C-alpha cells in the first residue's frame, strides 16, 4: 500500500484536469529526462457535512509515474475516467518501476511544483 511521490492538485473548479502536450509533469530532481511521464488520478473524498448529510469534498488529482500506482498496468494514453496523461518532451514510453511509489514511513511527499512557464489549468491549485 503506497502513496503518490507528490502532494495533490485540488480541483476547486468544475472542469476535469488536463494539461497541454509537454506540460504537467511535477518537478523531481531525483528523476531523469527519460522518467518524465505519467498520469494524474482523481480521488473524491466524501465527508459528513454540516447538515448531517454525506457530501463530496473538492476532488484531488495525484500524479503517478507511468507504470507505477493504482493504474500501473495502464499504457500511456489509455482512456479511463478520472485518469489524465502528461509527458515532458523526450520522456521514454516505458514503465518507471525504478522510481515506483512512495512509502510515507520513510519519505515525505515532494511539494508539487511545475516549471516556470507552466500555469495550472483553470480551477486547479497545489495546496
Numbering used by the authors: 48 to 174
Reproduce text from the manuscript describing this model:
One central protein involved in the formation of regulatory ribonucleoprotein complexes (RNP) is the coronaviral structural protein nucleocapsid (N).
We further investigated the non-naturally occurring mutant Y109A, located in the primary RNA-binding interface, and described it as an RNA-binding deficient mutation. We determined KD values for des_mutant Y109A by MST and found that it binds Ext RNA around 25-fold weaker compared to WT. Considering a structure-based explanation, we solved the 1.93 Å crystal structure of Y109A and found that this des_mutation, similarly to the nat-mutants tested above, has no mentionable effect on the global NTD fold (RMSD 0.674 Å). Altogether and in line with previous studies, this study shows by high-resolution information that the tyrosine-to-alanine mutation directly interferes with RNA-binding, but not with the NTD fold integrity. A prominent example is the proclaimed loss of RNA-binding capability in Y109A that had been misinterpreted before, while we here–together with a recent study by Estelle et al.21–revise the effect of this mutant, facilitated by an atom-resolved view.
